[PDB]
Design an enzyme around this catalytic site. Structure first.
Site, PDB file in Angstrom:
ATOM      1  N   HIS A 134      81.551  60.942  24.607  1.00 33.94           N
ATOM      2  CA  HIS A 134      80.547  61.460  23.705  1.00 33.94           C
ATOM      3  C   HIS A 134      80.889  62.885  23.236  1.00 33.94           C
ATOM      4  O   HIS A 134      80.618  63.152  22.058  1.00 33.94           O
ATOM      5  CB  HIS A 134      79.081  61.358  24.227  1.00 33.94           C
ATOM      6  N   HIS A 192      80.293  72.258  26.647  1.00 33.50           N
ATOM      7  CA  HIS A 192      80.694  71.276  25.666  1.00 33.50           C
ATOM      8  C   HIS A 192      80.051  71.624  24.344  1.00 33.50           C
ATOM      9  O   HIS A 192      79.240  72.547  24.272  1.00 33.50           O
ATOM     10  CB  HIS A 192      80.288  69.855  26.092  1.00 33.50           C
ATOM     11  N   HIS A 199      78.508  70.012  20.370  1.00 36.10           N
ATOM     12  CA  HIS A 199      78.054  68.976  19.472  1.00 36.10           C
ATOM     13  C   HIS A 199      78.454  69.410  18.076  1.00 36.10           C
ATOM     14  O   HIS A 199      78.322  70.584  17.761  1.00 36.10           O
ATOM     15  CB  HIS A 199      76.525  68.790  19.546  1.00 36.10           C
ATOM     16  N   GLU A 251      72.298  70.690  17.245  1.00 37.17           N
ATOM     17  CA  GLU A 251      71.174  69.948  17.806  1.00 37.17           C
ATOM     18  C   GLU A 251      69.871  70.726  17.533  1.00 37.17           C
ATOM     19  O   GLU A 251      68.975  70.246  16.861  1.00 37.17           O
ATOM     20  CB  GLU A 251      71.406  69.689  19.285  1.00 37.17           C
ATOM     21  N   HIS A 262      77.010  74.303  24.235  1.00 33.68           N
ATOM     22  CA  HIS A 262      76.117  74.283  25.371  1.00 33.68           C
ATOM     23  C   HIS A 262      76.881  74.685  26.624  1.00 33.68           C
ATOM     24  O   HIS A 262      77.794  73.951  27.051  1.00 33.68           O
ATOM     25  CB  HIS A 262      75.535  72.887  25.585  1.00 33.68           C
ATOM     26  N   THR A 303      69.945  66.700  26.209  1.00 32.67           N
ATOM     27  CA  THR A 303      69.953  66.112  24.882  1.00 32.67           C
ATOM     28  C   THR A 303      70.708  64.813  24.769  1.00 32.67           C
ATOM     29  O   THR A 303      70.813  64.227  23.714  1.00 32.67           O
ATOM     30  CB  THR A 303      70.434  67.076  23.818  1.00 32.67           C
TER      31      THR A 303
HETATM   32 CO   LIG Z   1      74.868  69.396  24.835  1.00 33.25          CO
END
Ligand SMILES: [Co+2]
Length: 257
Positions: A61, A91, A93, A103, A116, A195
């Protein structure tokens, strides 16, 4: 399993993880006019001098840069937090296009990506116990915009070819996460959740107001990763973000005026 496709994306997660429709889900839109300055907040302390990065992993992911969290080496304290929170991984997004990927949003604005830095509360002994607590985690969220390169990101970008596909990892020692931080530590904070599944309501979110800048070339390398495993149909790892969730009975607090 869950993911970010049409058939398995955020809008489906509630079937396996009913907590997706809970009272304190993340991310949220940060309405800058309605957030309120909180004079009770303590100063934020980011103590990363002794950080020990170990490894980078494509988990299907995102990619995680993992740290040794068996001692207080890289810790977050202060702000809204009581106690000591140890860095376990960071990590990102990110989007398929520079106009989406974050996010959290700020007055409905989406950034190109969001970092994050995930920390767990040492009073609970390990990560897995921490995620079962309302104050188990502290996640420092940092927006990324496209502009100039971020020098401290480059060592991450350049190893991504070695972890293209799900389940690949590489050694990643001696990386300094300080080089991913903006100048200011001003922030917004609120109680929320993971999340990604299992979407546990265990996170104190601390979202920095100042974005970092990364280059086009840097974000383009994120977009060359794959969600799939080696020898499976290629599916680019892009748009691995959950959209904003209802704020419900929460107030976002600001550390600044
Ligand atoms: Co995250």
């Amino acid at each position: 399993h869950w993911g970010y496709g049409k058939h398995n994306g955020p809008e489906h997660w509630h079937k396996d993880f009913p907590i997706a429709k809970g009272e304190r889900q993340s991310p949220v839109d940060i309405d800058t006019h309605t957030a309120k300055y909180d004079p009770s907040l303590k100063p934020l302390s980011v103590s990363y001098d002794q950080a020990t990065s170990l490894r980078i992993l494509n988990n299907g992911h995102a990619f995680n840069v993992e740290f040794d969290d068996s001692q207080d080496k890289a810790v977050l304290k202060g702000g809204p937090l009581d106690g000591t929170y140890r860095l376990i991984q960071f990590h990102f997004h990110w989007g398929s296009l520079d106009g989406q990927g974050s996010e959290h949003t700020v007055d409905k604005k989406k950034y190109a990506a969001e970092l994050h830095l995930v920390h767990w509360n040492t009073k609970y002994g390990d990560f897995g116990k921490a995620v079962q607590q309302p104050d188990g985690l502290a996640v420092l969220g940092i927006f990324l915009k496209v502009g100039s390169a971020k020098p401290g990101l480059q060592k991450v970008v350049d190893v991504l070819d070695s972890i293209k596909t799900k389940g690949k990892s590489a050694d990643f020692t001696n990386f300094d996460p300080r080089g991913l931080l903006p100048e200011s530590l001003d922030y917004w904070t609120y109680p929320g959740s993971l999340t990604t599944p299992p979407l546990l309501e265990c996170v104190t979110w601390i979202v920095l107001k100042e974005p970092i800048s990364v280059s086009s070339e840097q974000v383009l390398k994120f977009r060359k990763l794959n969600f799939n495993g080696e020898g499976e149909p290629e599916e680019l790892m892009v748009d691995n973000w959950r959209p904003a969730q209802p704020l419900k009975n929460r107030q976002i607090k600001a550390s600044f005026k």
